[PDB]
Amino acid sequence: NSLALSLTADQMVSALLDAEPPILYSEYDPTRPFSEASMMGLLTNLADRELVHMINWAKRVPGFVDLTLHDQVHLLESAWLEILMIGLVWRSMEHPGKLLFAPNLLLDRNQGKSVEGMVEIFDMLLATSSRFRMMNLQGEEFVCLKSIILLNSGVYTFLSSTLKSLEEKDHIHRVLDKITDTLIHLMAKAGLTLQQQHQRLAQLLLILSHIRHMSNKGMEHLYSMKSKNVVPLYDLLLEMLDAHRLHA
Amino acid sequence: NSLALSLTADQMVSALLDAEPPILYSEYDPTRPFSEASMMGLLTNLADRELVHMINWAKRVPGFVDLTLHDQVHLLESAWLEILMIGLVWRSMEHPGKLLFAPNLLLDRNQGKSVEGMVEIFDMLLATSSRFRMMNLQGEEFVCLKSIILLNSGVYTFLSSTLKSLEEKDHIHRVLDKITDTLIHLMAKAGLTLQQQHQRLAQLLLILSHIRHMSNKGMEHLYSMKSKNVVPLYDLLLEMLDAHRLHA
Numbered sequence: 001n002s003l004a005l006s007l008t009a010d011q012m013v014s015a016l017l018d019a020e021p022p023i024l025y026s027e028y029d030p031t032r033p034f035s036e037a038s039m040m041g042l043l044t045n046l047a048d049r050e051l052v053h054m055i056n057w058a059k060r061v062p063g064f065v066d067l068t069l070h071d072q073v074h075l076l077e078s079a080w081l082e083i084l085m086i087g088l089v090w091r092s093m094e095h096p097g098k099l100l101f102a103p104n105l106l107l108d109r110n111q112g113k114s115v116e117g118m119v120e121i122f123d124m125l126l127a128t129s130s131r132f133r134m135m136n137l138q139g140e141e142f143v144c145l146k147s148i149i150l151l152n153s154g155v156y157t158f159l160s161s162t163l164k165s166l167e168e169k170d171h172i173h174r175v176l177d178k179i180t181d182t183l184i185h186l187m188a189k190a191g192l193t194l195q196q197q198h199q200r201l202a203q204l205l206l207i208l209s210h211i212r213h214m215s216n217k218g219m220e221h222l223y224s225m226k227s228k229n230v231v232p233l234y235d236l237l238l239e240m241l242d243a244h245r246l247h248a
Numbered sequence: 249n250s251l252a253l254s255l256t257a258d259q260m261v262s263a264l265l266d267a268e269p270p271i272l273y274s275e276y277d278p279t280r281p282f283s284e285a286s287m288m289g290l291l292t293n294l295a296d297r298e299l300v301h302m303i304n305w306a307k308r309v310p311g312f313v314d315l316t317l318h319d320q321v322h323l324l325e326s327a328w329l330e331i332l333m334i335g336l337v338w339r340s341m342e343h344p345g346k347l348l349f350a351p352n353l354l355l356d357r358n359q360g361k362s363v364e365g366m367v368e369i370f371d372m373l374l375a376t377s378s379r380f381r382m383m384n385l386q387g388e389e390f391v392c393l394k395s396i397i398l399l400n401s402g403v404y405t406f407l408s409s410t411l412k413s414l415e416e417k418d419h420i421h422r423v424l425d426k427i428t429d430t431l432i433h434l435m436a437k438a439g440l441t442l443q444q445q446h447q448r449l450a451q452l453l454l455i456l457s458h459i460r461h462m463s464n465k466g467m468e469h470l471y472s473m474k475s476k477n478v479v480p481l482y483d484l485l486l487e488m489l490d491a492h493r494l495h496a
């Protein structure tokens with residue numbers, strides 16, 4: 001019984017849409033040459049800035065703040081990259097063959113070749129973008145999916161069985177069911193038949209497994225550069241996630 | 249129009265069930281000590297033997313042989329490990345805390361600690377097994393899911409856009425929709441309401457994203473041992489997949 005399981009389909013949608021994060025710009029001098037900037041440095045700087053905003057977004061996803069601090073952290077540490085990728089793919093949907101990492105930063109596959117291992121990832125992201133185009137993915141659907149990833153990605157890795165942990169997983173699976181009801185709701189409204197509904201649902205959810213795959217590939221690349229000497233992501237997340245209530 | 253898109257739910261189920269592969273045994277001398285055998289050597293030998301049988305299984309999955317040789321190969325090269333894992337998890341469903349890799353080879357997490365990186369994977373597989381138990385996963389559902397993985401895992405990585413390739417992807421997405429219809433069918437029969445249906449469907453499909461994750465982790469481990477000097481999996485698959493029609 002909470003301000004999460006009570007909501008109706010349209011309430012969840014509105015909640016998710018209003019919670020959407022902003023679209024950041026790549027930080028580079030626009031009046032200066034380009035073959036000067038570090039593509040990676042740019043992508044990394046952008047991701048880091050977006051993370052800060054991803055936290056605000058998560059806290060506004062119905063049911064998320066009802067969880068424990070550490071559970072909230074685990075889920076984000078597990079899904080952060082997939083969340084960034086789906087957003088990226090969503091933005092690029094209307095730019096065939098390009099990835100709109102930022103309004104002032106559109107890259108085609110050729111531009112991903114200046115870095116080892118990056119070209120493969122760019123092609124998977126582009127292919128995902130085309131898939132969405134093909135499916136005519138809607139913004140209402142996009143938000144549900146992105147919220148689904150936040151909750152589902154790290155739910156199978158809680159290396160705990162305490163009573164509290166069982167109550168936590170139950171809650172998560174309950175919220176996910178509500179998001180499922182919403183997606184179906186959004187489809188019935190649209191005019192899709194019942195068959196087309198369960199079919200579109202499957203099609204969308206199965207894309208999530210490819211997004212997971214892209215994150216793993218991305219984690220591999222990321223983890224090959226940085227070294228075991230940097231505040232482990234867990235902590236940064238914890239610091240930003242464990243906020244006080246002073247700036248009332 | 250083919251012996252695939254024509255079938256009815258019960259026909260697909262029967263097809264999938266009758267096509268099930270056999271349960272192989274680990275090859276080791278049962279009358280000899282155990283701390284003697286190579287855990288990895290055993291797991292690798294088993295997987296290799298199962299692959300041979302996975303090919304026969306795939307060829308019997310409705311719609312699979314209508315695809316081109318190379319497409320059939322790509323899909324298997326992409327999903328083989330996930331297929332082995334789901335099967336493994338399915339077998340272990342009635343053995344809390346253990347992984348029944350084979351009837352004569354049951355291992356708990358302690359036994360996975362004799363090898364670097366393996367303990368993490370054992371825990372993800374065990375957690376998946378528990379999840380299925382919890383969901384009371386049915387054998388009819390299991391086969392649909394395993395078939396879904398075969399078709400969905402590598403469909404987003406066909407680095408081709410020829411007309412033939414578009415016709416190939418269309419076919420795959422059409423078969424997948426049929427498997428979706430089957431799953432729903434299997435649930436309505438069971439007595440689940442329409443809400444519980446789309447909800448159970450979501451729950452099952454979302455598990456597939458975790459199975460993908462386990463494969464990536466497994467591929468990382470596998471790829472860290474063997475060396476770039478072994479008949480690349482593509483070829484073994486091609487050889488076994490490109491069969492003649494002489495043993496009529």
Ligand SMILES: C[C@]12CC[C@@H]3c4ccc(O)cc4CC[C@H]3[C@@H]1CC[C@@H]2O
Nearest residue numbers: 043044046047084085088218221222
């Ligand atoms: C993490 C990487 C840099 C940042 C990239 C990014 C940065 C911002 C964003 O919104 C999405 C993505 C998706 C792919 C990410 C890349 C995968 C490999 C690279 O290390």
Ligand SMILES: C[C@]12CC[C@@H]3c4ccc(O)cc4CC[C@H]3[C@@H]1CC[C@@H]2O
Nearest residue numbers: 291292294295332333336466469470
């Ligand atoms: C591929 C590995 C050996 C074979 C293992 C196996 C072997 C047979 C099988 O039916 C399932 C699995 C799942 C995990 C696999 C392992 C993941 C890491 C290891 O290299």
